Structure formats: structure tokens, C-alpha cells
Write a protein that binds this ligand. Structure first.
Ligand SMILES: [Zn+2]
Ligand SMILES: [Zn+2]
Ligand SMILES: [Zn+2]
Ligand SMILES: [Zn+2]
Lengths: 261, 100, 355, 39, 446
């Protein structure tokens, strides 16, 4: 009855992969796609009850991606390749939006997980986890919405695993710390698949007996809106929760004067 | 930037999956070494038994001192901030008690 | 004279978001539960006590989920007296443990509104003005014993700006209605366990802020998880203050959370500092309640036949066959019933709006 | 800690007639105080 | 005995030959423990041996028991093997043939196991999935009907020979049908997946008798297991031994084929789960229970086939026979007779629980506990006395000599029972000779 779902979100920002391609490094987007497909095939291999969900995170939208080889594996790989080529071939940069819709892809993944769980019969319990690979830079404006995702997963007790390739994201670190998922940056991009298999492939119960690298240290500093500097102790607004370094009689954000006689 | 985007778009527009190129034993060996005990990913390692390093009587006395200093400083911070002249003498007495 | 004649031959025949208003950013909630004889009644299976305590644990969980910087106090009124079962604090595990322990309580006597309210007021008499003072009471029996006048206590509570909410079980009580109305709270009647859960969920959300409520610039500190490693020579363990006041061995950890104001060490968050009174929180805790500041408006329900657009859900690609399809207000996307319910209930954000 | 006056302090309170001819009054201060307040 | 138990008992060469088939690799990997699966995936691309201590350091100290269990299971299955690492060390490395075949199965490449059915186009006489399942049920019911001895089931004589080799029916009198033995009786009450699994285990244990490649048969069985129900496959490309084995499977109904010359074949859900044996198929939507068990030891059957009638009459006295219903009563007499026939009470209880009518499922216990306990008590009362043939040693004049002889006999492991207080004991007839000789030799040495 153990139904393991491993939703994989792929950072499919064309700009970062173009930068990497111009660098002519050993690792490209094709290798990333191949590693993701192999990991998903292995996940489906480990048990019949296991399910695979692959969604590509792109700036324009979040795409639901899904001869001597397994029939279902071959069909799934064909579908994934078809969808990714259809998206990237028609991926026309129209606008200055560079940050990928990371939050939207996570929200769509959570909706898909909820729909699967509703479709899952009471006879079986569907353990769910999400693995996200980070390649491009992190986004700022999504932060709040990103937070809305995190607790939501913690609402349904879903692990969130982060695989940073190039650009670190403290948001991902905090999400992994909160939801209990694993955060780790790949030192050598060509070795990505083994990092996926050795660490992110086993389930948490399997991870329980397994010995794994300790989680990275996570900080929780704050930005003082008037200057957005690091702050240890700050003045918290009781109206709109805006934080200030110095005492103020009127809050800039809530526009409500602090009635301190 | 748009040129790089077009370059990668054309590069992955005609894409074929690969299997041998996915991983190599040398890369596998490096990954194992990183994941090996004592590796960079395996931060630190074993630690020391702090419990045996301090007697339980010393631990209990430390608890007593912690509670005493905590209550003293709690009263100090309760007096703070000094908004009345009476609070100055009270905090001075608090500091004297802390010193004693 | 029914014996004249009778045959069964003929029997044998073939056949609720309000406006963008200020809410309870900081709440000091006290829960008072009756322990009278009537708690053993079977209004809710198996009895009032078991269902009440189970739903109370669920309420505590949800309330701490949606109110990170709040507090919960548990008081049990039985035998015309009140017992301060649990102190006002923010630990969910301790309160759940106390409720599980009290599951085996002795339901006897009658509730005493006066004593319980007096104890709650005395506890909340020194609370800061900015923090809201809200009390929730579960009333099983219709009779209360008052060692003094009750309306004077009502006047004192109103002067203390302490909100009182009552959720009964039997029927409406005039005194409870007056108490709820005068102090600004709400009085509700349980129809079943489902209605009980609905009322508890409605009470989970922060109440609308009163006009007289103050708006002060409170000062809080945000320490990090300073973990000391024995590889460092400065790995000096110290018993946590929260764990120190415990029967078992307090947690003697090398590192943890150290107060930025008085260097007090705490192994659990979010916990207000015992020594200097500093409210030690974390950045996610503040952002955890932002959905209250920015509620998600209900989507437009349109019949599938009258919806002349796409036939797949935007959130799950589901082939929409239901008679009702929910369209977003902002980006006007296509969502099925399941996604429409879940996003508003849990996600609180429309992905298309983010896009 | 003050206890309100209950109307059942008479009917509920009975002289405990233990089988071995025991007249356990179980004289308690609160019962006597309730009697004094009521009567 | 599960599938892995039989695989763990085969020769290394058979395992190596099986590993050549990607489907076999997939089956073996899927049947591994979770920790074993994780280790295999880790070692999937490791071209160098792994130090044994390094492998052991990966798991929790507390889970070292399960770690070693998985390690020994993998070693016995010969998925991996130990290698003489330079310096005297012992590394671990997967089988290169098995590893390559697994990579082909997973990564892709290589050659497909069989050609697609589109070469012959659509089937002229195609069937439906419910039709295939019903046909398989009919075939198995016919097999069991022949096992009963009813003249309705006229099956192949080779099938009867196979059953006899399995020992189910002994042909004491040639020409007359063989009489079903006690083991056949026990098999008769097994669940249909269990019945098929036991029959296939016997066939495999007797695979060499027909001159058929065990490796090829196992590979084809795994391919059937991973096949898709409702889809046919190409008969061609298989050895004549495999062709006759497929004919046998068709005779059992596990695979449907309209004509012996037909190049298509439809595997059945029974065949699909046949590899899993008894477990794995947790969602078996069995036929509705038609047996009502009343507190007065009465069974009511909503059935019409003679097969279930015989199954019920095996342990109950038939009373009435209606067209759609059979009224029987479970007595001490009938249950004791069935136990004398070799059937264990647990088999009857489990069978009744299996064929439980939906009405009785509403009861929190499936069946009245009184009846189950009564059946258990009848089974016990059958075996109340204990019989053991042996030799009595009772002429012990010394306690020290008795202790020494008892210790020596326990060393020989031939002790039946001992009584130090009376210095009396009983020994096996086989172990009697050795103990007697030792006693005489020690008397001589005295
Ligand atoms: Zn403000
Ligand atoms: Zn402090
Ligand atoms: Zn949907
Ligand atoms: Zn929207």
C-alpha cells in the first residue's frame, strides 16, 4: 500500500543554460534531462506502487512533462522528451522576465499531489516527496508566495528536496529545514546522477537506516525595510508586522501611527 | 543574452538522449569519495560524551546557578528600561546582588 | 378492544472573509472547558468529554499553525471550582499531552463561570495592551454556581478589554448570550461534531481587531540556530531554560538558540525569552500569517456548459467534467472543484496570479 | 477560591450508612458553610 | 516457498544464464529488499570494487541486522560478488553481465525481447480481458474438476502424469484414475494463486524431466509477469521446448490461444502474478463469497458448480441440494474425517474466511469465533495422544554414569526423553545402537 510519489521540478531557465553552453562546460541541459529521466525510471523501478511526476519550470509557464527497454519507461521517456522539446523549441523570450516561475511550479506540483491523493483509494497511503534542482539564480519577489508553498507542504507533511547546481538559494535551504527535505549542492555537475541516486533517490524510511551527510547550517536573519540590512533585534509593527531598526511613531507600510502616549 | 538563448534553444532543439555520457567510473569514484566517511559532504564526524566530562553534582549546581542568575536578570530586565528615578536604585541594587 | 380483528395481509403486497480589517496579530487565548456531570452525556459520540478533548487538540494544532506568536491556556471547571490545567504558553506538544492526560479526568460537579473568568482575568490582568486578550469557553451544563455577582465580573472584563467567546452544547443560555454580546465575542450552539469542528475552525482565525486596541511598535529579536561544534574550542554546552524547568535531565546541547538580549539559551522556538521578556521568533513565523493579511477571494463558480473556454483545469490539467468550474478573479484561469477548494483552503495563492 | 451555593447540598448529602452500623457523617467544612449560608 | 527461495537454490551457472535476459534482471531487482535495491542502484555504475567495510559503514548500527540480511540475500542471489582487491582487501562488485543487462533494461538500448504484434496486424478472432480472465478461471476449474475425479474434465494424460510426479494423485491401479493423496487434499484447499504457485514450483523442480531449459522457462515466465494484460505477443522466436511449455500453459488457461498454429498469445492476470507466487497481489478481487456460516454449525452455499460442492463436502455433511443453494452442516464427525484425510483445521478456517459471504463480512469478526474454536478443538482432539517408538534405558545404578551417558547421547543428538530424578531415559532406535556401544565400551574401559 506504500505509494511513493517523487515529483521532480526542473529549473528550465533558457538563459542560465545558454550561459553554461557558451562556457562549453562538460555539463549541459541534455545531461540534466537524461539524469532526471534515469532517476524517474529508477524510482518507478523500485516498486510497482511508486508513481512519477515530472514538471518543468520555465519562465513562460510550468509544463507538466508527465527496443531493449521497458515499455512503460520507454513511453514515459518519449513523452517527456516530446514535451520538453515542444516547450523549448517554442520558448520565445518575449519580455525581460528572467527569474523562473519557481513558486508556480511548486504550487502546480502540490495541486497535482493533492489530486493524486484524492484519486488514491483509502486502501493505500500515498507518501509524497518533491525533488527540485536549482540551476539559475533565485528569485526575490516570489519569496512571500514561496513561503505560502512551504507551510502548505508542511500542512500535508511532504518532503522538499533541493539540488543546487550553480546558484545557492537560502530560500531552498529554509524550505528543506522546515519540511525536513534534503538540501545539497552538487560539486561536479557531470556526477549529478549519482548524487540523485545515492542521496535523493532513497525514501525517508530508507534514509532513516541510511547514513547521509549532515544538513547544512541555515541562518534566519532579517532585512530592515528602511534599509534591508541584517538585523538582530528590531522593532516589529503590531499592525502590518513591518520590522524597523529604529523607533518610529508612524509605520511606513501600514501607514498607522504607533499610538504610544 | 538573447544570442545565448537562441544558441541553447537550437542546441537542445535537436537533442538525443544519451546513456554512457550520463556518468563515468571516475566521476563515480569522486562521488563515492565525497560521500565516503570523513569526506567533505560528511562534515565533521564522531563527538565526545559531554555527560561523563562533568559530574552530575556539578551539573545540578550549574542548574541552580542558572536559575538564580536567570531570576536575578529577569528582575533586572523587568526594572529596565528605567523610566522612573526609583528604577535606577533598584537596578543598582540588582547589579550589587549579581556581583555578590 | 384492538383484539376484535387484525391481519397483516395488506402489509404483504408486491412492491467567511470580512473586509480588509485589522486582526489579532498577537493573541492570548484561554480555553475553559466544563467538567460537570453533564460532560458524560452522549450528545456527541462517545461522550462530550472525549470528542471535546479530541477536537480541542485539533484546535490547538490548527491555532498554533495559523498563529505562530500566540498563546494557549487550558482551565477545567468542575465541582463549582476551576483548575488551571495548563499555563498560558506556546508549546503545542505540552498542551496536547495535557489534553491527552485529562482525557481520563473525572466529570463531576457543576461549572463555575465566575471562578474561571476571575482566574483568567487575573492571569491576563497584566498583559500588554497591544496583545489581544481573548477567552474561549465550552459550556456543557446549563447551570452555573456563582460565589458572587457575575455581572460585576462582566463589567470588570469589559473594562479590561478581554474578549469572551462561548460555544455551548445543549441550547442557548441568556447569561452566556449577554456575556458574548457585551464583551464583543460570539455565542454559538453545537449541532453535531461537524458543526463543532466548523466552530473551532472559525475560532482558529484571528478575530477582527477592536477600535480601542492599541498599535504599539513592539521590539523582537531573531536569533539564529547557533550550533557549537566540538571541533571548535568554544563548544560550551548549557542547559536550555525551557528544558531546565523539567523533571527529566534538561537538554545539555553544545549549541542552539541564544538570546540576543541576555544570552539566554533556548532549544525550542518560537519562545518568548523568560529573562528579558524578548519575543524570540523566526522569519518564517512572521510570514506564516501573511495569508491573513492577504486573503484569497472566492472564485467565480460557472457551469461547465455556460463556461465557453478551456476544458482542462489550470492547476492539474484535469479533464473538467463537473457541472461547476471555478474561474479565478485575477487571472481568470480554469480550476476544478478540488483545486478551487484546496487552493483557497490551503495554498491561499493562485498560481496564475503569481505568473 | 470561593464556591457558589448549590441547591443540591441537602438531597445529595446523606448520612453515610455503612453496613457495619457505621454512621459516617463525613463532616466537611464546606458542607457546613453551605448550610449556614443557605440556612 | 517464495520465488526467491527457489532462485537462491540454483547453481551459479543457471543464475548467470538467467542474468542474460533483461526481464530476469528486472524481476530479481524488484524482488529485492528496499536496502538491497538502493545498494544495487548505487552499484549500477560502479566499475570498481567496493571495500566491504566501506559498504558496511553506510547503514545504521541498529539496522546492521537487516543490512546483513540484505547483504547475504544479495550474495546468495549472486547479483554481486567479492573480488580480491589489491593488498589482500576484498572489494564488492556487481556481476558485469547482470549489470550490463540491467542497464540495458533501464537505460535502454539493446534488442527488444520480442517483435510487436503489428507485424501480423489486428487479430481476426481477438477476445476481451473479461473473456480471457473467464477462460482462465474455466481452465483452472476444469483442472480441479479432473483432480476431483468427475468424468466432466477430460484432460491430457501428460497433465495427469505431471500431477502424479507432483504426488497429488498416485496411480496405484493403472487404467483407473489415481486417488488423490493427503498432500493433494491440502493443495485442494489452497487459494488459487497459492495453487498455481505450488504447481509451478513442482514443475520447476521437475523441469529437467521433459528436457526443457529451466533458464529459458524462467525467463519466459518473468516476461509474462511483466507483460500487459489484454495484449497479445508473438509466439515465434522461441525454442520448441518453450513452444511445448507454452502449450502446457495454454492447457492450464494461463495464456489464451485460439489455435495451436496461432502466433499470438494473451497472458492472463494469473500468469502475470504467477511470478509473485502467493504474495504481491494484494488487490485480488476474488469471486464473491457464497458461504453463510450460522451459529448452529450450518453452511449455506450460493453456488452451482460441483467443485465448490466437493470442497464444502470435504469437511461437512451435506443435507440439501437446491439448484442455487446447498445446505450442509459442519459436525465433529465430518471435521474429524477430513483431518484423518490430512486436511488441517487452519486450512478449513482460512478457506471459509476466504469464501465468506458479504453479509457475514459486516460482522466485526468474519466468522463466529465459537465455530472456529470448535474446529480447532476438534483438530487438537484428533491428535491428543503422542506416539514415539524408542528404547528405554532404565538399569541405571549410578547417577554419575546416567549423567555422562545422557550428555553423550545429547552430543549424539539421539535423545528422546530424559528423567534425571528417576535416572530413566528413552532413545531413538537409530541412536540406540551408538549409545549402547558407547556404554559397553565405557564398561570395558572401567
Ligand atoms: Zn505597520
Ligand atoms: Zn533574553
Ligand atoms: Zn484541478
Ligand atoms: Zn489567479
Amino acid at each position: 500500500d506504500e505509494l511513493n510519489l517523487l515529483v521532480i521540478v526542473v529549473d528550465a531557465n533558457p538563459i542560465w543554460w545558454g550561459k553554461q553552453a557558451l562556457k562549453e562546460s562538460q555539463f549541459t541541459l541534455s545531461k540534466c534531462i537524461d539524469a532526471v529521466m534515469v532517476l524517474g525510471n529508477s524510482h518507478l523501478f523500485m516498486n510497482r506502487s511508486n508513481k512519477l511526476a515530472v514538471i518543468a519550470s520555465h519562465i513562460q509557464e510550468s509544463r507538466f512533462l508527465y527496443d531493449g527497454k521497458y515499455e512503460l519507461l520507454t513511453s514515459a521517456n518519449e513523452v517527456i522528451v516530446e514535451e520538453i522539446k515542444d516547450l523549448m523549441t517554442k520558448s520565445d523570450i518575449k519580455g525581460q522576465h528572467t527569474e523562473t516561475l519557481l513558486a508556480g511550479s511548486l504550487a502546480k506540483a502540490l495541486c497535482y499531489i493533492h489530486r493524486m491523493n484524492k484519486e488514491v483509494k483509502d486502501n493505500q497511503e500515498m507518501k509524497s516527496r518533491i525533488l527540485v534542482i536549482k540551476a539559475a539564480e533565485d528569485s526575490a519577489l516570489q519569496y512571500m508566495n514561496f513561503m505560502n508553498v512551504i507551510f502548505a507542504a508542511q500542512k500535508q507533511n511532504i518532503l522538499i528536496d533541493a539540488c543546487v547546481l550553480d546558484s545557492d538559494s537560502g530560500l531552498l535551504q529554509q524550505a528543506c529545514d522546515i519540511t525536513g527535505g534534503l538540501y545539497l549542492k552538487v560539486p561536479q555537475m557531470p556526477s549529478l546522477l549519482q548524487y540523485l541516486l545515492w542521496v535523493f533517490l532513497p525514501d525517508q524510511d530508507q534514509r532513516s537506516q541510511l547514513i547521509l551527510p549532515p544538513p547544512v547550517h541555515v541562518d534566519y536573519r532579517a532585512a530592515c525595510f528602511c534599509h534591508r540590512n541584517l538585523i538582530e533585534i528590531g522593532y516589529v509593527c503590531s499592525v502590518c508586522l513591518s520590522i524597523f531598526c529604529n523607533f518610529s511613531p508612524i509605520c511606513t507600510t501600514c501607514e498607522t501611527a504607533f499610538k504610544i502616549s | 543574452i538573447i544570442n545565448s538563448f537562441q544558441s541553447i534553444r537550437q542546441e537542445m532543439e535537436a537533442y538525443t538522449p544519451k546513456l554512457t555520457q550520463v556518468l563515468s567510473s571516475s566521476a563515480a569514484s569522486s562521488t563515492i569519495t565525497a560521500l565516503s566517511p570523513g569526506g567533505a559532504l560528511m562534515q565533521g564526524g564522531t563527538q565526545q560524551a559531554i555527560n561523563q566530562m562533568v559530574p552530575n553534582d556539578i551539573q545540578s549546581e550549574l542548574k541552580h546557578l542558572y536559575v538564580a542568575v536567570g531570576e536575578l536578570l529577569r528582575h533586572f530586565w523587568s526594572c529596565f528600561p528605567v523610566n522612573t528615578p526609583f528604577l535606577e536604585e533598584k537596578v543598582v541594587k540588582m547589579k550589587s546582588n549579581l556581583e555578590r | 378492544r384492538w383484539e376484535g380483528g387484525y391481519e397483516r395481509t395488506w402489509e404483504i403486497l408486491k412492491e467567511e472573509h470580512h473586509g480588509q480589517v485589522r486582526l489579532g496579530m498577537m493573541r492570548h487565548l484561554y480555553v475553559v472547558v466544563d467538567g460537570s456531570r453533564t460532560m458524560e452525556d452522549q450528545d456527541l459520540k462517545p461522550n462530550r468529554l472525549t470528542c471535546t478533548l479530541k477536537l480541542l487538540e485539533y484546535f490547538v494544532e490548527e491555532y498554533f499553525d495559523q498563529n505562530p506568536i500566540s498563546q494557549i491556556g487550558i482551565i477545567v471547571t468542575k465541582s463549582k471550582r476551576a483548575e488551571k490545567l495548563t499555563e498560558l504558553s506556546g508549546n503545542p506538544r505540552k498542551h496536547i499531552t495535557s489534553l491527552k492526560k485529562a482525557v481520563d479526568m473525572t466529570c463531576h460537579g457543576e461549572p463555575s463561570l465566575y471562578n474561571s473568568l476571575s482566574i483568567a482575568m487575573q492571569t491576563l490582568k497584566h498583559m500588554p495592551g497591544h496583545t489581544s486578550r481573548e477567552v474561549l469557553i465550552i459550556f456543557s451544563s446549563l447551570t452555573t454556581c456563582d460565589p458572587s455577582n457575575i455581572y460585576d465580573l462582566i463589567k470588570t472584563l469589559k473594562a479590561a478589554k478581554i474578549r469572551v467567546s462561548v460555544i455551548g452544547l445543549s441550547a442557548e443560555v441568556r447569561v452566556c448570550t449577554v456575556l458574548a454580546r457585551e464583551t464583543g465575542g460570539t455565542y454559538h450552539v453545537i449541532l453535531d461534531e461537524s458543526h463543532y469542528k466548523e466552530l473551532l475552525t472559525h475560532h482558529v482565525s484571528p478575530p477582527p481587531a477592536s477600535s480601542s486596541s492599541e498599535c504599539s511598535l513592539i521590539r523582537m529579536g531573531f536569533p539564529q540556530h547557533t550550533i557549537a561544534s566540538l571541533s571548535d574550542q568554544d563548544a560550551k554546552p548549557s542547559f536550555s531554560m525551557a528544558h531546565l524547568d523539567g523533571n527529566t535531565e534538561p537538554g545539555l546541547t553544545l549549541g542552539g538558540y541564544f538570546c540576543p538580549q541576555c544570552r539566554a539559551k533556548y532549544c525550542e522556538l518560537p519562545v518568548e525569552c523568560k529573562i528579558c521578556g524578548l519575543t524570540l521568533v523566526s522569519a518564517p513565523h512572521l510570514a506564516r500569517s501573511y495569508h491573513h493579511l492577504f486573503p484569497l477571494d472566492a472564485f467565480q463558480e460557472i457551469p461547465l456548459e455556460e463556461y465557453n473556454g478551456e476544458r482542462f483545469c489550470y492547476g492539474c490539467q484535469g479533464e473538467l467534467k463537473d457541472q461547476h468550474v471555478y474561474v479565478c478573479a485575477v487571472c481568470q484561469n480554469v480550476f476544478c472543484v478540488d483545486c478551487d477548494v484546496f487552493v483557497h483552503d490551503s495554498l491561499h495563492c493562485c498560481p496564475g496570479c503569481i505568473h | 477560591q470561593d464556591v457558589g451555593i448549590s441547591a443540591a447540598f441537602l438531597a445529595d448529602v446523606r448520612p453515610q450508612t455503612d453496613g457495619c452500623n457505621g454512621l459516617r457523617y463525613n463532616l466537611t467544612s464546606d458542607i457546613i458553610e453551605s448550610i449556614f449560608r443557605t440556612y | 516457498r517464495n520465488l526467491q527461495e527457489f532462485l537462491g537454490g540454483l547453481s551459479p551457472g543457471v543464475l548467470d544464464r538467467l542474468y542474460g535476459h533483461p526481464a530476469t534482471c528486472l524481476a530479481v531487482f524488484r524482488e529485492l529488499p528496499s536496502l538491497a535495491k538502493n545498494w544495487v542502484m548505487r552499484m549500477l555504475f560502479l566499475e570498481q570494487p567496493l571495500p566491504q567495510a566501506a559498504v558496511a559503514l553506510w547503514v545504521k548500527k541498529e539496522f546492521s541486522k537487516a543490512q546483513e540480511e540484505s547483504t547475504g540475500l544479495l550474495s546468495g542471489l549472486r547479483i554481486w560478488h567479492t573480488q580480491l582487491l589489491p593488498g589482500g582487501l576484498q572489494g564488492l562488485i556487481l556481476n558485469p553481465i547482470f549489470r550490463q543487462n540491467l542497464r540495458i533494461a533501464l537505460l535502454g538500448g539493446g534488442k527488444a525481447w520480442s517483435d510487436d504484434t503489428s507485424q501480423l496486424g489486428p487479430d481476426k478472432h481477438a477476445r476481451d480481458v473479461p473473456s480471457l480472465d473467464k477462460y482462465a478461471e474455466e481452465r483452472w476449474e476444469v483442472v480441479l474438476h479432473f483432480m476431483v475425479g468427475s468424468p466432466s474434465a477430460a484432460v491430457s494424460q501428460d497433465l495427469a502424469q505431471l500431477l502424479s510426479q507432483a504426488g497429488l494423485m498416485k496411480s496405484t491401479e493403472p487404467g483407473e484414475p489415481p486417488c488423490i493423496t493427503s498432500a493433494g487434499f491440502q493443495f485442494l484447499l489452497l487459494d488459487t494463486p497459492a495453487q498455481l504457485w505450488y504447481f509451478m514450483l513442482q514443475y520447476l523442480q521437475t523441469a529437467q524431466s521433459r528436457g526443457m531449459d529451466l533458464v529459458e522457462i524462467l525467463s519466459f515466465l518473468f516476461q509474462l509477469s511483466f507483460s500487459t494484460l489484454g495484449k497479445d505477443y508473438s509466439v515465434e522466436g522461441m525454442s520448441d521446448s518453450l513452444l511445448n511449455f507454452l502449450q502446457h500453459l495454454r492447457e492450464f488457461g494461463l495464456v489464451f490461444q485460439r489455435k495451436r498454429k496461432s502466433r499470438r498469445y494473451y497472458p492472463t492476470r494469473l500468469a502475470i502474478n504467477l511470478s509473485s507466487g502467493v504474495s504481491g497481489a494484494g488487490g485480488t478481487v476474488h469471486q464473491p463469497g457464497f458461504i453463510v456460516v450460522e451459529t448452529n454449525y450450518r453452511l449455506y452455499a450460493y453456488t452451482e458448480s460441483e467443485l465448490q460442492i466437493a470442497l464444502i463436502a470435504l469437511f461437512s455433511e451435506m443435507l440439501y441440494r437446491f439448484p442455487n443453494m446447498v445446505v450442509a452442516q459442519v459436525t465433529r464427525e465430518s471435521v474429524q474425517q477430513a483431518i484423518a484425510s490430512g486436511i488441517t483445521a487452519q486450512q478449513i478456517i482460512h478457506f471459509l474466511r476466504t469464501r465468506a459471504h458479504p453479509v457475514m463480512l459486516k460482522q466485526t469478526p468474519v466468522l463466529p469465533p465459537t465455530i472456529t474454536d470448535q474446529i480447532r478443538l476438534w483438530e487438537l482432539e484428533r491428535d491428543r495422544l503422542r506416539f514415539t517408538e524408542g528404547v528405554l534405558y532404565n538399569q541405571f545404578l549410578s547417577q554419575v554414569d546416567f549423567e555422562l551417558l545422557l550428555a553423550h547421547a545429547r552430543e549424539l543428538g539421539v535423545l528422546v526423553f530424559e528423567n534425571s530424578a528417576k535416572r530413566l531415559m528413552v532413545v531413538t532406535p537409530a541412536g540406540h545402537s551408538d549409545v549402547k556401544r558407547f556404554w559397553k565400551r565405557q564398561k570395558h574401559s572401567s
